Each structure stands twice: as C-alpha cells, then as structure tokens.
Design a protein around this ligand. Structure first.
Ligand code: MYR
Ligand code: MYR
Lengths: 91, 91
C-alpha cells in the first residue's frame, strides 16, 4: 500500500469525536489538512506517540519550529487552534 | 445592559464569525448557551468590557471562580474551549 491518505479517515474520526464532545466542529477538508501537516512535521507521532502531554507538547514544539523556519502562511490556519484544543483535552 | 435574551443574536453572530475564520465551528445552540453563561458570570462585559486580551482574561477568571463555587458540573462543556479559542484570537 502506497496510498497518500493512510490513517487519514481514522484520524478525522477520532479528532471529530474528541472535539465534538467539547462543542467544536471542524470541516472534513480542514481535519484532513491538519492530519497531513501533523504527519509532515511529526511522522513519529502515530508510530511511537500516545495521546499524552509529553508527546503532544513535542508535536507543538515541532510545529512551532516549522512555523519559525517556513513562515506562518505555509501552515493551516486551523493548526494552532486544533493543537491547542487537543492539549486541553489531554490536561 | 444584559437582560434575558438581549444581545444574544448579535453576540452569537460575532462569535461564529470569529471562530469560523480559524476553522472551528460552533452550533448555534451551544453558542447561545455560552452567551447565557458569560452574561451570568460577567454581566459587566458587554456593558463596560472590550474585546481585548485583558478583559477576556478577566472573564476567564470569573468563569473559573464560578466553577470553584458551584462545581465543574454546573458549567457548559463548551465554555472552556470557546473561551480558549477566543483568547488565542485576541493574542
Ligand atoms: C457592528 C458590529 C458590532 C459588534 C459589537 C457591538 C457590541 C454592542 C455593544 C454592546 C451593548 C451592551 C449594552 C449593555 O451591556
Ligand atoms: C503496497 O503497495 C505494498 C507494495 C509492496 C511491493 C513489493 C514489491 C517488491 C519488488 C522487488 C522485490 C525484489 C526482491 C525479490
């Protein structure tokens, strides 16, 4: 399998359950944009990471480095909001 | 001055616009509930407040104060998430 969208539908489905139980809703295309950004910046996360603060704080650091190095317009507008909400959910 | 449903449609319309531009969407019912909660804890905000980080931080303190006195179970589950997104917008 060499699909470009591996894990995408699972990620979207999980993201959408976690966010919807806090009253927030992301468009599918936007959820997919975020996922592609996450696996670009932090490909180790699905493989070795968990839904805990240490790992999610690391994903944050790595996304921030990416912004600093590439400018805040190669980044999806929804990346910081979604990251932030997941951080809080993990708290 | 706040009073029942007064200001509610306008508050909701601005809130939805601000959130939506960041790729986060709230149901109208959740936004109404968030408004009723804000005006309960911080009725000064429409009257004397401004849409700035300092006043929003006060609103934040007052919502946590309300949680402390009445317990986590009394407050809408979307309250903290919405407040947090608006705080980022204001940064
Ligand atoms: C045209 C966009 C305006 C959006 C913000 C306007 C806020 C209206 C002022 C609030 C009036 C509150 C009076 C009391 O409290
Ligand atoms: C998903 O599409 C998995 C694809 C795996 C293809 C493997 C083919 C390997 C061909 C080279 C073999 C050389 C060793 C005999």
């Amino acid at each position: 399998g060499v699909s470009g969208s591996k894990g995408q539908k699972l990620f979207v489905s999980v993201l959408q359950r976690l966010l919807s139980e806090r009253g927030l809703h992301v468009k599918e295309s936007s959820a997919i944009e975020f996922y592609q950004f996450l696996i670009k910046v932090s490909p180790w996360f699905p493989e070795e990471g968990g839904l805990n603060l240490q790992d999610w704080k690391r994903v944050g650091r790595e996304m921030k480095r990416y912004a600093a190095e590439h400018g805040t317009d190669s980044i999806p507008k929804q990346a910081a909001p979604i990251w932030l909400q997941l951080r809080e959910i993990l708290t």
